[PDB]
Amino acid sequence: KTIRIGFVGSLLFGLLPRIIHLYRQAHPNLRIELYEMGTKAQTEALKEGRIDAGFGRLKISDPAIKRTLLRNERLMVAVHASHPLNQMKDKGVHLNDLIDEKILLYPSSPKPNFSTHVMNIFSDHGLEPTKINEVREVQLALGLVAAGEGISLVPASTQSIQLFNLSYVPLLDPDAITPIYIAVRNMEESTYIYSLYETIRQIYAYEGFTEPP
Template sequence: MIGNSDQGRVGVNLRQLRYFVAVCEAQHFRRAAEKLNVSQPPLSQQIKELEIELGVQLLTRSNRIVEMTPEGTLFLRRAKAILESVEEAGREMMNFTATGGGIKIGYMSAAMASSLVPILSALREANNGATTFKLHQLDPQTQLRSVARGELDIGFASFSARQAPLSFDDKLLVIERAWQEALKVALPRNHPLAGKTVISLGQLQNERLIVMARHPLPGFFDQVISLCYNAGVTVNIVYEASQLPEVMTLVAAGYGISLVPERSSALWDRQLALIPLSQSPTTDVSIMYRADNTSPVLRRFRGLLKKIYGSGLAGNYQPV
C-alpha cells in the first residue's frame, strides 16, 4: 500500500505537486524557492512530506544539483498532467461563469447542420454572443453513446420521437421531435425517373433500395419499409447505411435509390435527383439528450428550437 493513510488514501496536495515540479525544472532547491517566491526550508519540507506520503524517494540531493530518481521521473509526468488538468478545469469554470455555459451539439450531415443556423443565431442574440458551442458530425450510434457519456449535450438524428426515455449505456436519454421533413426520392441522375416532377411510391416497384440502418433506433427504417409495404411496393434492400451522407453517396454513384429527408439531403441536389412523392409522407428529425442534463443552455436551446421550427417537442417528459 502506498502512503501512510489508514484508509489507503494518498494525501498529496496541489502545493506539493507544484513545488515538486518547480524543483525538477530548476534542478535546485534555492532556485525553485526563488521562482515560487517562498523560503527554502518550507519547500524542502513539502518535498520530504510528499516522498513520505508516496513511500518512495523522488529526488537525490547534493549541494550543487538535484536529480530525479526513476520514481521521480515517472511521478513528474503524473504531477504535470494533474496540474494541467486542474488549470484546464479552472479555465472551463471561468468560461462557464462568463458565458452562462456552453453546449456541445451532434448532427448527422452538413445539410442537417445548416438547419441549426437559426437556432444558434437566436441563442447568440439571447445571450449577447456569450454562449460557446461545439459542433460534431457523427453517426446516430456514436451520438447516442456520446450523449450518454456526457461528451455531447444534445444530438440530432433521423429518429422517430419516443414517449418514454431510452435506456442507453445505463443512462436515460430523452428522444424528442425537433422538426418534421418531407420525404423525397433520391435517384441517380441517369435514372429513368430522374426527370419527373413528382413520383408515386408505386413507381418504385422492384427498385434497389439503400436505406438508413435499423439500428440503433428503428424509427426511420421501419417507416420507409412500412410506406413501401402499404403501397404494395416490393423493394430490394441492397445496403443499410449508418449515415445519411453514405446513403447519398451510394445513390449518386448509381447503386440504388433511397427515400430521404428533404431538408437534410438538400445539399446533394446537384449530384443526384431529389423528387417529391405524391403521397407527401413526412419523417421526424429528433433530438436526444440525457434526462439528468439540467444545463440552462440546453433548456434555452430546446426552447428556441421549439419556437423557431414550431413543430412542438414530442411528449411531456421533463428532465429531472
C-alpha cells in the same frame, strides 16, 4: 460555459447551422462543441454525460432520456436526371413505385439507424425492396446516385446538395417522413438547453414550421 451537442450528419445540410448561429448571438462566451453520431449513440452519450443534447431521426425509448418531436420532415427520392421516376411530375411518385429499383441506403453503422427507419416505412405497408445497398453517409449515397448507381431516399433538407444531373422527387405517401427529435437527459434543467430549444422555436416560427410543445 461548455455545451456538447450530438447530431446526425444530414442535419448539417439543413437547419442545424442557422440554429447554432442564432444560438451563438444569444451566448457570446459559450463554448459550443458539436459531435456527429447516430441516434442510438446519442442516447448512450447523454446517459454517460458525453453530450448535453442530441438531434436525431429515430425514436429510441429509454426512461433516462426525455425525447421531443421537433417536426415531421418529408422524405424525397434522389434520382439521376434521366430516371423514369423523374418523368412523373404529372401523377407523382409513391413508395410502391420504388420496389424494384436499386436503392442506396445509409448509414452503414450499427442498427437501428436511418436505413432501418426507411425500410420500416416500406414494411409498414407490406413492401420489401429487394435491392438495397448500405453506404457510409448521405453525401456518398447522393454522389453514387449521380454516378448512376441507383436511387436513394433522403430528407428534403438535403436538397442543399445540388450535384450535376441529380434530381429530388417528392413522395406522395403522407407517412413518407423522417421526423427530427431533440433528446436530453430525463432530469435536464439547464438554462443553456432551454435557450437552445427556444432558438429552434424562433427559427421555426420564422421558417413557417409548426411549433413544437
